[PDB]
Design a protein around this ligand. Structure first.
Ligand SMILES: O=c1ccn([C@@H]2O[C@@H](CN3CCCC3)[C@H](O)[C@H]2O)c(=O)[nH]1
Length: 124
């Protein structure tokens, strides 16, 4: 069964590319990562850094999570990311997305032993 850590990796990790640089990227990735089966997941971010680097964020700058929990962490360095946002004309099962590449500080929620990312909260 899929752990929270594994779910984070499936939903939010894409180390394979340095920067998502096809306009097709989100359309393909949201589908292949199984984020378009139940519904079109409205908003989702992929991080293009090593797993070790993203995991390291759990020991970085402690910040409040959007939900008010205290277990969020902001990366000290900017990271290569791709935001996927569902278009206004996207209709399930044909989920359509805008692909936006950025370099930003990520904010993740961490839990467990080992202490690892389980939620992507925001980028700033
Ligand atoms: O910059 C972002 C912002 C949000 N998300 C996604 O939406 C978050 C929760 N949202 C769903 C509706 C309530 C808040 C999910 O935890 C995360 O998967 C993201 O991937 N990148």
């Amino acid at each position: 069964k899929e752990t929270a850590a594994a779910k984070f990796e499936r939903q939010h990790m894409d180390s394979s590319t340095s920067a998502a640089s096809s306009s097709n990227y989100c359309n393909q990735m949201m589908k292949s990562r199984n984020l378009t089966k139940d519904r079109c997941k409205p908003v989702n971010t992929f991080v293009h850094e090593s797993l070790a680097d993203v995991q390291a964020v759990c020991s970085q700058k402690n910040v409040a999570c959007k939900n008010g929990q205290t277990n969020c962490y902001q990366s000290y360095s900017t990271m290569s990311i791709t935001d996927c946002r569902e278009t206004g004309s996207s209709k399930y099962p044909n989920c359509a997305y805008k692909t936006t590449q950025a370099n930003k500080h990520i904010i993740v929620a961490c839990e467990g032993n080992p202490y690892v990312p389980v939620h992507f909260d925001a980028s700033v």
